[PDB]
Design a protein around this ligand. Sequence first.
Ligand SMILES: O=C(O)CCCCCCCCCCC1CCCCC1
Ligand SMILES: O=C(O)CCCCCCCCCCC1CCCCC1
Ligand SMILES: CC(=O)N[C@@H]1[C@@H](O)[C@H](O)[C@@H](CO)O[C@H]1O
Lengths: 171, 171, 171, 171
Amino acid sequence: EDPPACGSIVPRREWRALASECRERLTRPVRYVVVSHTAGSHCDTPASCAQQAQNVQSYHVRNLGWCDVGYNFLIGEDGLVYEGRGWNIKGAHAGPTWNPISIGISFMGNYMNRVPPPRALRAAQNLLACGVALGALRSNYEVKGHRDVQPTLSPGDRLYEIIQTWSHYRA
Amino acid sequence: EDPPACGSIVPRREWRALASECRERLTRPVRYVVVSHTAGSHCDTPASCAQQAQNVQSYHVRNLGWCDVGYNFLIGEDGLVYEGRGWNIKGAHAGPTWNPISIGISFMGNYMNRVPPPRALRAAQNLLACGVALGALRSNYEVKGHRDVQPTLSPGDRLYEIIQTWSHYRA
Amino acid sequence: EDPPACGSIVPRREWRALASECRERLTRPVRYVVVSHTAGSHCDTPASCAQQAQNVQSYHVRNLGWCDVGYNFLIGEDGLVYEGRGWNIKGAHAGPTWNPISIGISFMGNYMNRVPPPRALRAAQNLLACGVALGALRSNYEVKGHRDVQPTLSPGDRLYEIIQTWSHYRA
Amino acid sequence: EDPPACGSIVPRREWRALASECRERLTRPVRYVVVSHTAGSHCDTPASCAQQAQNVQSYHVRNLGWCDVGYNFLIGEDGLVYEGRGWNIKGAHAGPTWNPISIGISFMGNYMNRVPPPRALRAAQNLLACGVALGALRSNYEVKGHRDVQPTLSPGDRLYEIIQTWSHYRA
Ligand SMILES: O=C(O)CCCCCCCCCCC1CCCCC1
Ligand SMILES: O=C(O)CCCCCCCCCCC1CCCCC1
Ligand SMILES: CC(=O)N[C@@H]1[C@@H](O)[C@H](O)[C@@H](CO)O[C@H]1O
């Protein structure tokens, strides 16, 4: 009983993100977590992965005109978590039905035929424990694959396969 | 007030579509068309394609719980157009901002590494010409690639390459 | 399906309802829920609200010739849910397009210049979760105001504004 | 501001309750449910029952010096459940043996030669099921009359014979 209790997360500024313009808030404790993949290339060093989070955000902000990067968090192959819209802000990653009730975490890369390395999976699962510890997620939150709530291949066959084994997975 | 029979279109009953539960209407004339791909398996024959349209609909209806397959029309490699939600019903293809202002056509298959055959491309273009003559689409309608309004690989690199050349395409 | 029954509902017999002659069943699970107001007298007490339920049913059966109170459920300002045709029977409350696909719940009163109390709103929302849990409603169900599916003032400006904030509301 | 759920409970603030000062927590899943009657005045309308929960709490807080009304939940003859200490706070209703291992619910009134109306009994069981849904109550939960765990006439002969006919009642 040490209050914070969880997660090292690379913050927005540390990855030089553009300021967010999003104001819509999620209502904690959140019950659903939606796992996607960027379906782009991977990265496996702090500097590349930080560079890739900037790209993704650029796509969503510069091209799509969104208020900030879609995801609440992004997972690098560097084994670090990148802060997106975070725990309190409604993300734009699952559709109008799941966005206001979920936390979207996206693995940077394409896992159709490839798996995230062990450290990326640990960072993702540690992030979720962190979420529960903070009361950001319900203790009995449910994890969905992106393809379970939207017509997409996301998070990729290999990763989809993995999250299906998870404690909190519920299709 | 003279209308043409531009419909080469395979009716829902003909591809044996489950009945639609969708009620929200599109107001005509519609200004935008959003092109996507199913990122699925392709089909080249009226028989294999009717089957594919069934599966794509099954996925959206049975797995995702939607009122009907999300696209307004699907395009087969058999060179035929499969009726989805049609010209009058709002689709569920490109998010809450674009769904209500556009018609969503999806080519059945994954075009990341393949272009659709000429006849598939002819069908799509003919469908659009059809739409204009029917008054369903504004004559100066704009084409967008899925990845232009939502974060996706869709419609696939090759197919995206192609649509960027189209007369009605717009940044 | 699932043993655990749901919610507190004032049964037909308790509010002394005339027996139903209504036979057309709804197809479970139902996708839509239409919210109306009776535009009639309000009541704040079990005694007065049972009475009002009786009068609404009476007027529908005796003056309109319907087989049963047209609503599937009624909501009182006493904060209780009154059993109408229930979950399995088709109501007569939204027109012929909608009556066969939806559940109709009506707040007893006229909401144009009044909002119904929190307990009424609570009863209504709780009833819907119960329907979902029972399998009578789709987990994804969509809530609509009576005025969205028919030309009407129902459910009344004030109540219509409130249901627009419901997490399952789709215009 | 905490408004989800559930068994349709009138929240603390809605009945104008003094803020609680209790800090002791209950270890969920809880095992026992004790049923008592207030032995006070009964009420049949939301207005009168809110006033009655207030009176009970005031007596407990001003006169006995307790941190909060001692019951976790109060049941009014209006068919509504009134929030007391709730699911997460240890109450003061059945003694030091029973207060830390049980949830105490109290029917407002004197049921010696009187019976609570069906709607009051409905709210009660509905309350109990919603407790399970949350993990606050263990599905195996046993129901005890106040008089089964303490020397007291509570909850009254009449109400006591009834709770014995309940499915989870253990003598
Ligand atoms: O979570 C939200 O949508 C609000 C954040 C604002 C940025 C997004 C703009 C909305 C434009 C439609 C884009 C689709 C993409 C998939 C998720 C549902 C929205
Ligand atoms: O929202 C309202 O005002 C109406 C009440 C909804 C009915 C209750 C649903 C039964 C299952 C409880 C689910 C709850 C547990 C509390 C936290 C969020 C979800
Ligand atoms: C799961 C979900 O709600 N997604 C789609 C959404 O993209 C669209 O805004 C809406 C319009 O019909 O249809 C929904 O089914």
